[PDB]
Ligand binder design. Structure first.
Ligand SMILES: O=C1C=Cc2cc(N3CCN(C(=O)c4cccc(Cl)c4)CC3)ccc21
Ligand SMILES: O=C1C=Cc2cc(N3CCN(C(=O)c4cccc(Cl)c4)CC3)ccc21
Ligand SMILES: *Cc1c(COP(=O)(O)O)cnc(C)c1O
Ligand SMILES: *Cc1c(COP(=O)(O)O)cnc(C)c1O
Ligand SMILES: [Cl-]
Lengths: 428, 429
């Protein structure tokens, strides 16, 4: 198909994330290749090379078409594409489970593979609910979180997303009614944690779990919070016998400057979700980890089992690529790499602080954010960044990047320069 | 890792479908290769080749490691592994969407890609709920189905699964309360449809959709029903203004003898889900299709968009292998292939009818079921089939297969013989 033919088919037949059919303000741009940190996009009938500043929605940590990851896929393809995980096991699943148990916060000893982040969150909730039912406390079935969060798009996951960001107003009478604490602040305030505890105290008997994104909240507003809040959450959850669940689907695998964001606080949750960067952005795969205690309690319960089992559970191809991606990350000095990337983002975005339409500039690991004083018009921002050789996708009032770890210092400054120029145009 | 090392890691660290940690009756069997219709499994330290009678849970329709499908993946890998679908589009998505709108029941004009069947079902429900909210009818928010069904494991999908199979009694006060009609019978009875209609009529003002598996109910009990029931559902839904959703995640792509099970009835749903065999069993991918009316009504609604968007939406690699798998199916005489498979299954399983413990033997396309009068002992049945060169996974009182379309008559003979033998062993207590 030609790019023009692709556009015609797309406009007629393809839904996009959070999109309409037939009411799009701008056509999507045709992507024809991806290699390293670069995408080849069609603009005015011509191929152009642009930096993937978004890592293709947090996924492409090692860039596209990395030789080690490409080879991991084709090596596995030669032997076994897939087998059902019901009654069978295999080397890719075992290798990946061993790795994940080793590198995640201490105590996360069992691994449930699924096919997406939203599913992994539903699995986490199911683990928590079956856990309490295994303890003879079925009343513990609600979830508590703080505002500003995002946990996916399936119906239970929706229930713990930020009520405003998640448009809960459109879902009246449909979603499970969960417990929401106020937005967690950036700076550490003991009064916030005291208030969180006071609220949890009123609901402890009906709460299965607290579920949060640690350190960085992604789709709900690219907000950062002091890691000390995670200490407090761990303490509150321990004292009130409520499970702690960390959704690290966006934060995992080095993105915030620690291997997992929980590591910034030395905190171990009872249950943990991972996903976006798990396969280095090749293939859909997610995992939910839980402690031995949680696993045993579920296993000794009425069902005698966790009542979940995806068709493509532990897919050999996805697991094989994930093994290679995780090993590639661990086999290099990733911490120095992310530190250098963060320094590049900080240096490159500093000039944005003086722009008339800029409210805040913030960086956490390989994440850089320009917060603007108005919603960013994509019809202007997207081509402006493309004109500067960068693929950027703002949302709401935020111009942000989470670049591939393989970006050179020069590429990082090209990304930040495009971001600054987008922010300048916002104020025009 | 060696097979022994894999078993040690697995026992300590790996959940399996609907399994425990540390309380498994039997260890899983280590799989070390898969090629065509055959799995290589480790049995007493040694690699043995056995027939994948289950198609690895409906997925492996063309068998494992099909050269065309391997090639499609490798080809796409060299160009573009993945890009975000937010603000970008690409050839594999466009090619697959075009194929799917062309081959699915008439009127299904738009395609929402996701990463699994359960998600595709939740997308379908979201489409239905946003549709009615876009019509100023937010009260239409419940779902209706018949018993015996399976729609996935996410919490909304659970709510429309069979209450027994889905263990609803363990989920008291957690699940959405949906409307259940009685188990749909095998043989066509207009009285069943009339009763379904009367029940729906009472709830019409609060119902967004009827959601069913067409012709074959899979995980809820491997039951078949007359296609005319689907004709009735289409009619009822039309007259009472309730959307019709067909979950073809297990039935799609030729499995029941028609390209889609809906085709047996000659009706189109408003919304349709596909998944298990979409990529020919290589990779997780699913799709939810809906009519232009549904799409336009959502798009004109309060959000102005369908409020859903998975990270790996329309993944180029998965889409590329799916295009290859669908083209491979369409480029051959698949109808004759499935008819031959159905005939082979019928011929091979016919002897089981006379067995003491067997209550029913039924075949529908490339699906064969022996139903027993008592639960099948998995600790006995699994090695019994393996000893005969076949991987089978019974559950409850059912010994069944959904073999790859590439299975030869000799391979079908081997599969059915193992099934009959498992059923023979059931009768001996
Ligand atoms: O290999 C596999 C890949 C997925 C999978 C699932 C699976 N299940 C899920 C469905 N199932 C149920 O009993 C079930 C559960 C809930 C509701 C309903 Cl209606 C029936 C049997 C076990 C077995 C094996 C595999
Ligand atoms: O390329 C993409 C792949 C997935 C994706 C999602 C996506 N979103 C999802 C989240 N989002 C939200 O506004 C949102 C929605 C609900 C709740 C909450 Cl808290 C925030 C922005 C748009 C944009 C782009 C892509
Ligand atoms: C993206 C995301 C999810 C959902 O993942 P999908 O693969 O899109 O279903 C859940 N939680 C967090 C924190 C995420 O960033
Ligand atoms: C397996 C199945 C699902 C769920 O698919 P997953 O990929 O396991 O989430 C939904 N509906 C039907 C009819 C199925 O057979
Ligand atoms: Cl080449």
């Amino acid at each position: 198909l030609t790019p023009e033919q692709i556009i015609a088919v797309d406009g007629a037949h393809l839904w996009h994330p959070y999109s309409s059919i037939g009411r799009e303000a701008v056509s999507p741009v045709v992507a024809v290749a991806a290699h390293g940190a670069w995408l080849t996009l069609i603009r005015d009938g011509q191929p152009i090379e642009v930096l993937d500043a978004m890592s293709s929605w947090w996924t492409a940590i090692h860039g596209h078409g990395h030789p080690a990851l490409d080879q991991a896929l084709t090596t596995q393809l030669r032997v076994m594409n897939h087998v059902m995980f019901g009654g069978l096991t295999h080397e890719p699943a075992a290798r990946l489970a061993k790795l994940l148990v080793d590198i995640t916060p201490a105590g996360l000893d069992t691994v449930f593979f699924s096919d997406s982040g939203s599913v992994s969150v539903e699995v986490a909730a199911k683990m928590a609910l079956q856990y309490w039912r295994g303890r003879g406390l079925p009343g513990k079935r609600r979830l508590m979180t703080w505002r500003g969060g995002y946990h996916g798009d399936t119906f239970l996951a929706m229930s713990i997303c930020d009520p405003h960001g998640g448009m809960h107003s459109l879902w009246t009478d449909v979603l499970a009614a969960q417990v929401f604490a106020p937005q967690v602040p950036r700076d550490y305030d003991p009064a916030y944690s005291a208030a969180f505890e006071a609220q949890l105290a009123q609901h402890a008997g009906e709460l299965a779990a607290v579920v949060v994104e640690p350190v960085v909240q992604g789709a709900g507003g690219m907000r950062f919070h002091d890691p000390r809040y995670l200490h407090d959450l761990r303490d509150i959850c321990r004292r009130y016998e409520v499970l702690l669940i960390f959704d690290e689907i966006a934060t995992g695998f080095g993105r915030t400057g620690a291997l997992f964001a929980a590591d910034h606080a030395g905190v171990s949750p009872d249950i943990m979700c991972v996903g976006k960067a798990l396969t280095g952005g090749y293939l859909s795969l997610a995992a939910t980890l839980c402690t031995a205690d949680v696993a045993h309690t579920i296993s000794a319960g009425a069902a005698g089992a966790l009542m979940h089992g995806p068709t493509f559970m532990a897919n050999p191809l996805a697991c094989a690529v994930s093994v290679a991606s995780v090993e590639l990350l661990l086999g290099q000095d990733w911490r120095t790499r992310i530190t250098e990337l963060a320094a590049g983002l900080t240096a490159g975005l500093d000039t944005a602080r003086a722009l008339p339409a800029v409210t805040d500039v913030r960086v956490c690991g390989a994440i850089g954010v320009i917060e603007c004083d108005r919603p960013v018009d994509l019809a202007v921002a997207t081509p402006a960044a493309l004109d500067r050789g960068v693929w950027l996708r703002p949302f709401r009032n935020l111009v942000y990047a989470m670049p591939p770890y393989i970006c050179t210092p020069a590429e990082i400054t090209q990304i930040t320069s495009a971001m600054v120029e987008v922010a300048r145009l916002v104020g025009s």
